[PDB]
Design an enzyme around this catalytic site. Structure first.
Site, short mmCIF file in Angstrom:
data_model
loop_
_atom_site.label_atom_id
_atom_site.label_comp_id
_atom_site.label_asym_id
_atom_site.label_seq_id
_atom_site.Cartn_x
_atom_site.Cartn_y
_atom_site.Cartn_z
N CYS A 45 1.40 20.64 23.13
CA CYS A 45 0.11 20.45 22.47
C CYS A 45 0.18 20.91 21.01
O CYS A 45 0.77 21.93 20.67
CB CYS A 45 -1.13 20.94 23.30
N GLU A 51 -11.45 17.32 19.89
CA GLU A 51 -10.30 18.11 20.41
C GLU A 51 -9.37 18.58 19.32
O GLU A 51 -8.17 18.75 19.53
CB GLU A 51 -9.50 17.35 21.49
N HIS A 79 -8.13 23.29 22.17
CA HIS A 79 -7.84 24.23 23.24
C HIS A 79 -6.90 25.34 22.87
O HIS A 79 -6.70 26.27 23.67
CB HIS A 79 -7.32 23.49 24.46
C1 LIG Z 1 -0.93 20.95 25.96
C2 LIG Z 1 -1.77 22.24 25.83
C3 LIG Z 1 -1.26 23.46 26.59
O1 LIG Z 1 -2.05 24.08 27.27
O2 LIG Z 1 0.13 23.95 26.53
C4 LIG Z 1 0.42 25.34 26.30
C5 LIG Z 1 0.71 25.63 24.83
C6 LIG Z 1 -1.20 20.22 27.27
C7 LIG Z 1 -0.59 18.81 27.41
C8 LIG Z 1 0.54 18.72 28.43
C9 LIG Z 1 0.24 19.23 29.85
C10 LIG Z 1 0.97 18.26 30.80
N1 LIG Z 1 1.20 17.12 29.90
C11 LIG Z 1 0.99 17.31 28.67
O3 LIG Z 1 1.16 16.49 27.76
N2 LIG Z 1 -2.61 19.93 27.23
C12 LIG Z 1 -3.38 20.10 28.29
O4 LIG Z 1 -2.99 20.50 29.37
C13 LIG Z 1 -4.80 19.75 28.07
C14 LIG Z 1 -5.60 21.02 27.95
C15 LIG Z 1 -7.04 20.58 27.83
C16 LIG Z 1 -7.91 20.69 28.93
C17 LIG Z 1 -9.24 20.28 28.83
C18 LIG Z 1 -9.71 19.76 27.62
C19 LIG Z 1 -8.84 19.65 26.53
C20 LIG Z 1 -7.51 20.05 26.63
N3 LIG Z 1 -5.34 19.06 29.22
C21 LIG Z 1 -4.81 18.02 29.88
O5 LIG Z 1 -3.74 17.44 29.65
O6 LIG Z 1 -5.68 17.64 30.99
C22 LIG Z 1 -5.46 16.65 31.98
C23 LIG Z 1 -4.11 16.94 32.64
C24 LIG Z 1 -6.59 16.78 32.99
C25 LIG Z 1 -5.51 15.27 31.33
#
Ligand SMILES: *[C@@H](CC(=O)OCC)[C@H](C[C@H]1CCNC1=O)NC(=O)[C@H](Cc1ccccc1)NC(=O)OC(C)(C)C
Ligand SMILES: *[C@@H](CC(=O)OCC)[C@H](C[C@H]1CCNC1=O)NC(=O)[C@H](Cc1ccccc1)NC(=O)OC(C)(C)C
Lengths: 181, 181
Positions: free
Chosen positions: B148, B72, B41
């Protein structure tokens, strides 16, 4: 560095909490009985939020030296029945210098995070945002806002509370045993 | 826990960098030669910012399993003369479970920070923001956005890259040796 983080993790689990006042969210270390400490600039009011719960502040003591100079710590007595594990044992009588320190932060923005800041040297006098302040400890590591109140530690030592920084240098107020009565 | 943080600190100093793409700021681990990895992402474009410097991306490979299911991770080959210290040795052939892990993050928002997440268990299948995803590792610790790309580690092991979470549970994509050629 490892034994430092080990000590820190255990210390934070046992003695730290997350606190909100009107001036922000801070890491708070409970010291003994119902006494804890925050950085001065947390400016705690008559109530604080402690792990999302309203808690009445029975007393607060903004700390200064004999010549009235800011120490940048506020001691606060909580209207609370649960007592903090006594950690006065871990507080030095004077400003601690160490070769390897860890800074521990525990808020919403930084939940149970730890930074290896390395070498801590007694810095002493510092003009902090206009405010002449004493007993500062300095470490090189790239500081950030919302880390104030973070607990500075090494193996078997609680050195002080994080109160300031810019860019690449941070400062803690030394957390001295005699501040506790 | 201590030996884990010790390993992590050294790993991040040697192999990590801070990267910006159009989708955000991420922690990036260099793996060998000019190959590194980001969470999918991060969607890296033809150029990225690597420690504030413009770097051309010669290749990117969004990883999927044999049945096309999202892993991913994106592997990226940097237009860069300096080579990463080869850390392929530290990558398991299959999904690692450990009793004590550390998650390491290195961006502007979280500069050289480490979290003790404890127990990592192979979670496997997870619907990630609509996206069916495999090879996930799960740990209990209260996750946050901008983490992330964080590198999940224990003593002598690089387990995977942080890609998701909500509240109190986080997930990494397993970082498997065979992904590197
Ligand atoms: C990290 C990525 C990000 O967008 O940060 C900005 C640099 C983040 C993890 C965070 C968010 C809240 N808790 C965490 O540990 N990752 C995401 O938000 C990922 C993004 C994603 C969406 C769809 C497919 C693959 C990755 N998504 C995510 O955590 O989704 C949930 C909340 C539905 C599980
Ligand atoms: C922590 C306090 C805060 O306001 O965060 C919100 C909860 C912050 C330290 C951060 C900021 C950037 N690097 C860091 O390490 N502390 C300050 O910003 C203190 C506030 C203060 C001002 C005046 C007297 C006493 C405390 N000030 C500070 O760092 O000032 C400098 C930048 C002029 C040295």
């Amino acid at each position: 560095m490892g034994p430092a983080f080990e000590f820190a993790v255990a210390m934070m689990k046992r003695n730290s909490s997350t606190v909100k006042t009107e001036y922000g969210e801070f890491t708070m270390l409970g010291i003994y009985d119902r006494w804890a400490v925050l950085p001065r600039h947390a400016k705690p009011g008559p109530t604080i939020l402690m792990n999302d719960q309203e808690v009445g502040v029975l007393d607060a003591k903004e700390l200064v030296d004999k010549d009235g100079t800011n120490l940048e710590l506020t001691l606060l007595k909580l209207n609370r029945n649960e007592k903090f594990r006594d950690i006065r044992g871990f507080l030095a009588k004077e400003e601690v210098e160490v070769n390897e320190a860890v800074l521990a932060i525990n808020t919403s923005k930084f939940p149970n995070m730890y930074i290896p800041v390395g070498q801590v040297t007694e810095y002493g006098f510092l003009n902090l945002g206009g405010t002449p302040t004493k007993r500062m400890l300095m470490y090189n590591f790239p500081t950030r806002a919302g880390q104030c109140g973070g607990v500075l530690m090494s193996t078997g030592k609680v050195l002080g509370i994080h109160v300031g920084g810019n860019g690449h240098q941070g400062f803690s107020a030394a957390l001295l045993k005699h501040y506790f009565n």
